[PDB]
Amino acid sequence: ASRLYTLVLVLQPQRVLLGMKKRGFGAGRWNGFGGKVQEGETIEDGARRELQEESGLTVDALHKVGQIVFEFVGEPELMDVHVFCTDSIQGTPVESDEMRPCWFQLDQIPFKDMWPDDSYWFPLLLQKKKFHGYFKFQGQDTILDYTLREVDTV
Ligand SMILES: CNc1cc(N2CCN(C3COC3)CC2)nc(N)n1
């Protein structure tokens, strides 16, 4: 049993957009934009919805780039995160109640202030490789097990 989540990375030739999560799960960490997928919407619809809610941005096309499954010790539901990237965005990002957006140069990604798993799979995203990952967490800071592979179909 798993629950569906989205994650959107706006990746342009020299920069990537991240948001500082201001409240809730993962507050205090930079991340892409996203959240739970709702009943009645497709995964990609939910990714666009969360991007708009969290940054005001809309997008022409979202591309599937990864899937990451998370186990949190003691939590019954696996988190199934579908990761999307886009290069063309519509609008200028603006702060929301959940997210403070900032562009980062591709050699200045703030890994120490991101989810620890990003350090493993974010390079593959920047290298335009598609990937499947699995990370088992104890709490929010400690990776106990993980797998990571490149795939041809996300
Ligand atoms: C547990 N490791 C994670 C999890 C994660 N997501 C889970 C939570 N999710 C939504 C819950 O509100 C945002 C955002 C993506 N993103 C990243 N980069 N790493």
Swiss-Prot record:
Impact when changing L148A: Reduces 2-oxo-dATPase and 8-oxo-dGTPase activities and increases thermolability
Listed Pfam families: NUDIX
Record keywords: Cytoplasm, Hydrolase, Magnesium, Metal-binding, Mitochondrion, Nucleus, RNA-binding, Transit peptide
Keyword Transit peptide: yes
Cofactor: Mg(2+)
Outcome when changing E54A: Loss of ability to prevent DNA damage. Expected to cause loss of enzyme activity
Residues engaged in binding 8-oxo-ATP: F25, F33, G34, G35, K36, E50, E54, W115, P116, D117, D118
Binding site for Mg(2+) 2: E50, E53
Lineage: superkingdom: Eukaryota
GO-annotated molecular function: 2-hydroxy-ATP hydrolase activity; 2-hydroxy-dATP hydrolase activity; 8-oxo-7,8-dihydrodeoxyguanosine triphosphate pyrophosphatase activity; 8-oxo-7,8-dihydroguanosine triphosphate pyrophosphatase activity; ATP diphosphatase activity; dATP diphosphatase activity; hydrolase activity, acting on acid anhydrides, in phosphorus-containing anhydrides; metal ion binding
Residue stretches making up the Nudix hydrolase domain: 1-130
Residue window of motif Nudix box: 35-56
Effect upon mutating T153A: Reduces 2-oxo-dATPase and 8-oxo-dGTPase activities and increases thermolability
Residues engaged in binding 2-oxo-dATP: T6, N31, F33, G34, G35, K36, W115, P116, D117, D118
SUPFAM superfamilies: Nudix
Enzyme class: hydrolase
Effect recorded for W115A: Greatly reduces or abolishes 2-oxo-dATPase and 8-oxo-dGTPase activities
Activity regulation text: Inhibited by 2-oxo-dADP and 8-oxo-dGDP.
Binding site for N(6)-methyl-AMP: T6, K21, W115, P116, D117, D118
Post-translational modification: The N-terminus is blocked.
Protein name, entry field: Oxidized purine nucleoside triphosphate hydrolase
Originating organism: Homo sapiens
Gene: NUDT1
